[PDB]
Amino acid sequence: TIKPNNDCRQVNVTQLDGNENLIRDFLFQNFKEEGTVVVGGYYPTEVWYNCSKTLTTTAYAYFNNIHAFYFDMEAMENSTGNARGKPLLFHVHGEPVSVIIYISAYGDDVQHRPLLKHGLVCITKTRNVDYNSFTSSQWNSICTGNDRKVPFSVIPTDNGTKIYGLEWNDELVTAYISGRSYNWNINNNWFNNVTLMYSRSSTATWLHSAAYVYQGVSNFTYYKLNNTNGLKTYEFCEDYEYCTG
Ligand SMILES: *[C@@H]1O[C@H](CO[C@@H]2O[C@@H](C)[C@@H](O)[C@@H](O)[C@@H]2O)[C@@H](O[C@@H]2O[C@H](CO)[C@@H](O)[C@H](O)[C@H]2NC(C)=O)[C@H](O)[C@H]1NC(C)=O
Ligand SMILES: *[C@@H]1O[C@H](CO[C@@H]2O[C@@H](C)[C@@H](O)[C@@H](O)[C@@H]2O)[C@@H](O[C@@H]2O[C@H](CO)[C@@H](O)[C@H](O)[C@H]2NC(C)=O)[C@H](O)[C@H]1NC(C)=O
Ligand SMILES: *[C@@H]1O[C@H](CO)[C@@H](O[C@@H]2O[C@H](CO)[C@@H](O)[C@H](O)[C@H]2NC(C)=O)[C@H](O)[C@H]1NC(C)=O
Ligand SMILES: *[C@@H]1O[C@H](CO)[C@@H](O[C@@H]2O[C@H](CO)[C@@H](O)[C@H](O)[C@H]2NC(C)=O)[C@H](O)[C@H]1NC(C)=O
Ligand SMILES: *[C@@H]1O[C@H](CO)[C@@H](O[C@@H]2O[C@H](CO)[C@@H](O)[C@H](O)[C@H]2NC(C)=O)[C@H](O)[C@H]1NC(C)=O
Ligand SMILES: *[C@@H]1O[C@H](CO)[C@@H](O[C@@H]2O[C@H](CO)[C@@H](O)[C@H](O)[C@H]2NC(C)=O)[C@H](O)[C@H]1NC(C)=O
Ligand SMILES: *[C@@H]1O[C@H](CO)[C@@H](O)[C@H](O)[C@H]1NC(C)=O
Fold first, then answer.
1. Residue 77 CB–ligand 2 contact under 6 Å
2. Rounded to an integer, what distance in angstroms lies between the CA atom of residue 163 and that of residue 19?
3. Whether residue 96 has a cis bond before it, omega within 30° of 0
4. Could you tell me the domains of the chain?
5. Terminal Cα distance for the chain, rounded
6. Measured in angstroms, how far is the CA atom of residue 179 from the centroid of ligand 6?
7. Torsion angle of alpha carbons 202, 142, 84, 151, nearest 10°?
8. How does 166-202 read in b/e, with b if 16+ C-beta sit within 10 Å?
9. How far is Cα 104 from Cα 166, in angstroms, rounded to an integer?
10. Pocket lining for ligand 4, CB < 6 angstroms
11. Hey, whose CA ends up nearest to atom 18 of ligand 4?
């Protein structure tokens, strides 16, 4: 789904520390009964992407023809207290409205930013966005004018064991955070592509690091879910005709 890029490598998302049950908990969010079911949808698979650059040059990655975007972070420092975040910005394109997700770094030392709220949603009608100004300015003057600015908290006490996600169609947007999902009714023409800024130089809101993995989902995926005596297992169906027959 990603454009070719020498900075981006493939990684098994489950084998990273704290990610043993990352995909398991997402699949069983809605299946609460006992027994078996085969579910289809825009679910994440095993192999994700880690994009990083040792030099402090601004770098971008592009995902095309995707319906969903998921990402995962490492555990924050001092997660139970004054948690210090790591930065990540991406932009879901559409007309006449597009969406920018920005997660800033550092802690309570960022001026004017509400306490323990590292996440920002900018709903904007701007056609061309200057990401350098967005990620280099003071937090109070970032997403202003006619844009809609929504601060939100990641859950630092989750320690990066839960998946973060976004799915969209032309009538509804769904956000996945912690073990919960939020719905947003909006009529829009999404372009089905995402721009991601994974590295730049340190600023008042950005810290040079590589702490995220991400995946864009474009194809319909099938999982077989089995709940036996409270033991929850899953299997990725390569073809639907095999696991169901
Ligand atoms: C992702 O992992 C696979 C397989 O990992 C194995 O199964 C996991 C559940 C866990 O137990 C791992 O420790 C296991 O190794 C990797 O594919 C393996 O690659 C090695 C080294 O080249 C090779 O000897 C094995 O035969 C491969 N196994 C299979 C089943 O093909 C794969 O490299 C990882 N993908 C990445 C890092 O992108
Ligand atoms: C780890 O963070 C704790 C907790 O920070 C406090 O709570 C946060 C949610 C936020 O509101 C911070 O501003 C708070 O300070 C730190 O412990 C606090 O340290 C301050 C230092 O001025 C002190 O006044 C508080 O009493 C402490 N609160 C406690 C102990 O409950 C702690 O220092 C951090 N550890 C690091 C950064 O290593
Ligand atoms: C996230 O990690 C933190 C820090 O490792 C965990 O906080 C600890 O929780 C245990 C209970 O298992 C307490 O006894 C410790 O005192 C806590 N450590 C602190 C406050 O420094 C936290 O439980 C983890 N959250 C999860 C796993 O959801
Ligand atoms: C995301 O997709 C949209 C829609 O396909 C792309 O917008 C088109 O881009 C081409 C090439 O620059 C232009 O010629 C078209 O006029 C655009 N169509 C529009 C705006 O409706 C957009 O470029 C894609 N973005 C990325 C980063 O791939
Ligand atoms: C993504 O991969 C990079 C390397 O490509 C990882 O960062 C490296 O971490 C090791 C161990 O701390 C260091 O020796 C390297 O210098 C780091 N490289 C860079 C460019 O920072 C990074 O941890 C990976 N991200 C994950 C797993 O989330
Ligand atoms: C769901 O998983 C459970 C546990 O792995 C499976 O139940 C086991 O099935 C095997 C062979 O069918 C039996 O030998 C075991 O005794 C069963 N375990 C228990 C605790 O009953 C079950 O078959 C799986 N479900 C499906 C539909 O494949
Ligand atoms: C996604 O599905 C399309 C269906 O046309 C197929 O051509 C493509 O190879 C699939 N991609 C992956 C990564 O499975």
1. no
2. 9
3. yes
4. 8-243 (2.60.120)
5. 29
6. 27
7. -160
8. bbbeeeebebbbeeeeeeeeeebebebbbbbbbbbee
9. 18
10. 62, 64, 93, 191, 193, 195
11. 191
